[PDB]
Amino acid sequence: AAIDKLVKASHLIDMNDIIREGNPTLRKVAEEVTFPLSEKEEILGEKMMQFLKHSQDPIMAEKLGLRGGVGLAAPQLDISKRIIAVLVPNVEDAQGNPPKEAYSLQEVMYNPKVVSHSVQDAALSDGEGCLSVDREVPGYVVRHARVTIEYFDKTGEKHRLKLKGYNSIVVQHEIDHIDGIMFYDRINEKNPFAVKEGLLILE
């Protein structure tokens, strides 16, 4: 399986492991995973994480030739399991000083789900990006402003958590992937930049 390739100890994940628009796996609803987790599912969570670190540190990003990213779902890897990893860095201030906490969210989540949400919608102002997609796709991708979610980590401990702003978008986009939904499915068909009143635009 694709899975055996990805878990070899010496294998680092890169762009050639990411499948593309049209691979039929991108559109399936992913299988739930069970605990305690198999060695491969544990390992895959870390490789996935390690990839997002690698993809965000300026020189590996260069050695491995990666595009910057803040989340990755197992479907993008030809593996149809409910495993997403998220990694959203905080920024430096104007004086160059690193922030307090490195990340606003660093987690590999098993079986993630949205359990409730806000009635208000939000959309990133710069639109959304995807590694399985090589088209420029303009427009606002409309998501819930605020989400509550549960998920398990790799020890099987269950987590409940509320998110807003940008972290909320990113988890939402990753969860969609494990249900076969692509982002452009939430861009308005007639006008891509239509703004329903009250839609929150994050800049």
| Residues annotated as catalytic (active site), given as ranges | 174
> Binding of Ni ion at residue 93 (CB under 5 A)?
yes
Task: Fill in the per-residue mask, 120 to 149: x = in contact with Ni ion (CB under 5 A), - = not in contact.
Answer: ----------x-------------------
Q: What is the total count of residues that contact Ni ion (CB under 5 A)?
A: 4
DSSP 98: P
Residues comprising the chain, all counted: 203
Stretch that binds Ni ion, among 13-21, 80-88, 101-109, 187-195 (CB under 5 A): 13-21
As a whole number of angstroms, the distance between CA 75 and CA 3 comes to 11
In the complex, least distance from residue 11 CB atom to Ni ion, rounded to whole angstroms: 6
Question: Which of 31, 92 has the CB closer to Ni ion?
Answer: 92
* Residue among 35 and 191 whose Cβ is closer to Ni ion: 35
Q: Is 130 annotated as contributing to ligand binding?
A: yes
Strand partners, 159: 151
Q: Is 159 annotated as a binding residue?
A: no
Alpha-carbon torsion (39, 41, 47, 50), positive or negative: negative
**Using an 8 Å Cβ cutoff, are 151 and 110 in contact?**
yes
Do residues 46 and 59 make contact, with C-beta atoms less than 8 angstroms apart? no
- What's at 41, amino acid-wise? E
Q: Quick one: which segment of 27-35, 81-89, 95-103, 105-113 binds Ni ion (CB under 5 A)?
A: 95-103
* CB 12, CB 54: distance < 8 Å: yes
Give the amino acid at 137: V
d(CA 99, CA 137): 32
| Min dist. Cβ of residue 46 to Ni ion (A) | 6
Least distance to Ni ion from the beta carbon of 66, Å?
12
17 makes contact with Ni ion (CB under 5 A): yes
Q: Which residues are annotated as a binding site for Fe cation?
A: 130, 173, 177
Where do contacts with Ni ion occur on this chain (CB under 5 A)? 17, 93, 97, 130
